[PDB]
Design a protein around this ligand. Structure first.
Ligand code: HEM
Ligand SMILES: *[C@@H]1O[C@H](CO)[C@@H](O[C@@H]2O[C@H](CO)[C@@H](O[C@H]3O[C@H](CO)[C@@H](O)[C@H](O)[C@@H]3O)[C@H](O)[C@H]2NC(C)=O)[C@H](O)[C@H]1NC(C)=O
Ligand SMILES: *[C@@H]1O[C@H](CO)[C@@H](O[C@@H]2O[C@H](CO)[C@@H](O[C@H]3O[C@H](CO)[C@@H](O)[C@H](O)[C@@H]3O)[C@H](O)[C@H]2NC(C)=O)[C@H](O)[C@H]1NC(C)=O
Ligand SMILES: *[C@@H]1O[C@H](CO)[C@@H](O[C@@H]2O[C@H](CO)[C@@H](O)[C@H](O)[C@H]2NC(C)=O)[C@H](O)[C@H]1NC(C)=O
Ligand SMILES: *[C@@H]1O[C@H](CO)[C@@H](O[C@@H]2O[C@H](CO)[C@@H](O)[C@H](O)[C@H]2NC(C)=O)[C@H](O)[C@H]1NC(C)=O
Ligand SMILES: [Ca+2]
Length: 595
């Protein structure tokens, strides 16, 4: 901060200041500083960027420049020695359902997205990088280790492109490079509605004035809605199966169809918007198309905030929750609501939470057909298994009945993601999310691990013995030291995730502080936080405390057996009750009488 006004990215428009509704962009939440928290602006910097040349070149770029005296280890080598494992047996989280992993990806995507630099639908630069592994400009490739099998089978590196930065897209002249966040920092359902003035509108159904979202017209799920297909060919969803030829879904957020289970979640959310809107027309027949939209929207936003803050964070943060996120005391206009750059890597802990397979279950929660369990890697940008395999009901029950993967210092990220990741731009299932995430810390100029322990007021080990004590693991601590040669050099993502878990939580002390602070701020900094006096009415608020993800399921699918607490592990049928029983969102507090 303070070279104070830079930035052409920015969409440019005006504030109402008495509108009961959030903008699409995030603008106007904060009154004296109207752009704070808007999409298309820099991620905040809780600490100064640390770049090889102090301005923009990442560490690992210039082969002979060290970090603190040592060579940073290769992204992919750190991946092979620390991150991978072979045996999926015993890896499941006994007390977290698959939906736990999945709500996290919804929340993260509502909060932050640093898109890659594209810079041309022309250049052998998406090819000069692909084919020849030549580092330069925005090509910053992940080279393979000696002894890496991928050498024999794939090539010399994995393509990787530096993330977008503020102000331009051309090589910028001067400050310190800052990455763009392309979405709104406020937990506002921007992943359903869009963060842009352009997209938000294209998503709506403006033929009927019922304030509905547009739905797929080419296909149905027992007369229930699917998302509209996305327009844009070439389509990666089309690529994974050229026979089925089913395109990716068009949603509020571009990553919606990265995986069948995430696309599933988006579908439930679109469905609740229309459900809520048609319900609202019923109650206020005079109500307008816009008002229908803004009011369903406003409710969906409150809903995501509630499930997130009431059900999800306490079982990520565990005992640390109340020390970072005290109870709400009212909107604080002085709090900086912006997502920080480090949060977007801290939140990546969810990557260790992803299991190797996905199941479809039938109405008795039994294996659905003969090819019921699928390897995760065949589900990246796979929409055809939704539309041409029985809809989302079978995946939705899998979400409740199956478990998340447990972070585990020895078994860290599944091969499904570490070896077989499919990237929407290239052809092979053969990318490493782990290495990527590492290459990306470096891309974003993150401070190393001891800077972050310092920031969160935690001890900073400087020796192997120091490291074992913190990590509580001799083996892991020595692998890290051999590779990094000083804890000060440990990339934050893997430093943060290597720590044992706090009591009742799913992240360690370092992560709980970083996650914790961000969430506190996005809630205290949000003028439209659902509990903020005057946003909803006391009576509306009373009716919103009854929302539950189980209800959401009941009202939007043909499942009639759900668990009451969806995020913990639940065995069918003992933990499964009748949909016909779960608290419903009483929706009458929203009535409007003009006399
Ligand atoms: C496939 C991928 C997932 C599941 C199979 C998956 C899941 C999650 C969860 C559950 C997260 C939070 C709990 C989460 C966090 C973040 N992700 Fe990740 N994710 C899959 C794939 C990807 C890919 C590919 C990326 C791009 C990484 C890059 O640097 O290019 C990715 C990103 C992120 C991310 C950063 C978002 C941003 O600010 O840009 C998380 C916080 N995920 N994932
Ligand atoms: C599996 O994980 C469960 C969910 O995290 C866990 O139970 C939860 O533990 C918290 C800890 O306090 C409790 O929270 C609430 O407890 C009482 C209800 O008895 C409330 O009156 C309090 O106000 C408080 O908020 C709950 O008891 C519970 N959360 C839920 C779902 O309500 C289980 O114990 C875990 N199982 C095992 C074996 O570890
Ligand atoms: C590309 O997608 C194809 C369809 O979207 C998919 O093929 C489909 O999957 C299986 C073949 O393994 C068949 O499922 C069953 O359907 C009939 C019922 O009408 C059964 O009687 C058959 O015996 C069969 O078991 C589908 O018929 C089939 N569809 C087509 C068009 O052939 C492919 O598997 C996908 N290819 C890849 C590599 O993913
Ligand atoms: C916009 O909304 C209208 C009204 O809901 C949709 O048209 C109706 O819904 C289906 C679509 O074929 C059928 O019941 C009727 O043809 C329509 N009924 C009415 C009351 O008009 C339409 O599908 C929506 N458009 C898009 C692209 O989502
Ligand atoms: C609103 O939140 C801000 C967030 O930065 C808090 O900042 C405080 O600043 C005041 C100075 O006016 C001091 O009390 C402290 O230096 C800060 N608090 C602490 C201990 O970090 C502030 O707490 C909040 N303000 C109000 C009025 O609620
Ligand atoms: Ca948002």
């Amino acid at each position: 901060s303070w070279e104070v006004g830079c930035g052409a990215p920015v969409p440019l428009v005006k504030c109402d200041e008495n509108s009961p509704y959030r903008t699409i962009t995030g603008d106007c939440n904060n009154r004296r500083s109207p752009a704070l928290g808007a999409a298309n602006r820099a991620l905040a910097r809780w600490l100064p960027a640390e770049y090889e040349d102090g301005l923009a070149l990442p560490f690992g770029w210039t082969q002979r420049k060290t970090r603190n005296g040592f060579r940073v280890p290769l992204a992919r080598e750190v991946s092979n020695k620390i991150v991978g494992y072979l045996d999926e047996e015993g890896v499941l989280d006994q007390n977290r359902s698959l939906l736990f992993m999945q709500w996290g990806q919804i929340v993260d995507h509502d909060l932050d997205f640093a898109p890659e630099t594209e810079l041309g639908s022309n250049e052998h630069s998406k090819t000069q990088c692909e084919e020849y592994c030549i580092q330069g400009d925005n090509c910053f490739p992940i080279m393979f280790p000696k002894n890496d099998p991928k050498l024999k089978t794939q090539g010399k590196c994995m393509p990787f492109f530096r993330a977008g930065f503020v102000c331009p897209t051309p090589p910028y002249q001067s400050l310190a490079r800052e990455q763009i966040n392309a979405v709104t920092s406020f937990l506002d359902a921007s992943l359903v509605y869009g963060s842009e003035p352009s997209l938000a509108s294209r998503l709506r159904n403006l033929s009927s004035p019922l304030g509905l979202m547009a739905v797929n017209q080419e296909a149905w799920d027992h007369g229930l809605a699917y998302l509209p297909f996305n327009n844009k060919k070439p389509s990666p969803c089309e690529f994974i199966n050229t026979t089925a030829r089913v395109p990716c879904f068009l949603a509020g957020d571009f990553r919606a169809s990265e995986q069948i289970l995430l696309a599933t979640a988006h579908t439930l959310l679109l469905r609740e918007h229309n459900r809520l809107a048609r319900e609202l027309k019923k109650l206020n027949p005079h109500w307008n198309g816009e008002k229908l939209y803004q009011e369903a929207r406003k409710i969906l936003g409150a809903f995501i905030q509630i499930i997130t803050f009431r059900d999800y964070l306490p079982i990520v943060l565990g005992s640390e929750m109340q020390k970072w996120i005290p109870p709400y005391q009212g909107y604080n206009n002085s709090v900086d609501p912006r997502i920080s750059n480090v949060f977007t890597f801290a939140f990546r802990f969810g990557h260790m939470e992803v299991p190797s397979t996905v199941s479809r279950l039938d109405e008795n929660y039994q294996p659905w057909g003969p090819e019921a369990e699928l390897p995760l890697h065949t589900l990246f940008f796979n929409t055809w298994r939704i539309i041409k395999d029985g809809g989302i009901d079978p995946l939705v029950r899998g979400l409740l009945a199956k478990k998340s993967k447990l972070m585990n210092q020895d078994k860290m990220v599944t091969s499904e993601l570490r070896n077989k990741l499919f990237q929407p731009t290239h052809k092979i299932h053969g990318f490493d999310l782990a290495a990527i995430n590492l290459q990306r810390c470096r891309d974003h100029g993150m401070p190393g691990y001891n800077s972050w322990r310092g920031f969160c007021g935690l001890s900073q080990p400087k020796t192997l013995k120091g490291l074992q004590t913190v990590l509580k693991n001799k083996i892991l601590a020595k692998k890290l030291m051999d590779l990094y040669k000083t804890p000060d050099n440990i990339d934050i993502w893997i430093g943060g995730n290597a720590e044992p878990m706090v009591e009742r939580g799913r992240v360690g002390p370092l992560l709980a502080c970083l996650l914790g602070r961000q969430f506190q701020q996005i809630r205290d900094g949000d003028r439209f936080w659902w509990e903020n006096p005057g946003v909803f009415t006391e009576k509306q608020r009373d009716s919103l405390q009854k929302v539950s993800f189980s209800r959401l399921i009941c009202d939007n699918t043909h499942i009639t057996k759900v668990p009451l607490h969806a995020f913990q592990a639940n065995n069918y049928p003992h933990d499964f009750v009748d949909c016909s029983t779960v608290d419903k969102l009483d929706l009458s507090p929203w009535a409007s009488r003009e006399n």
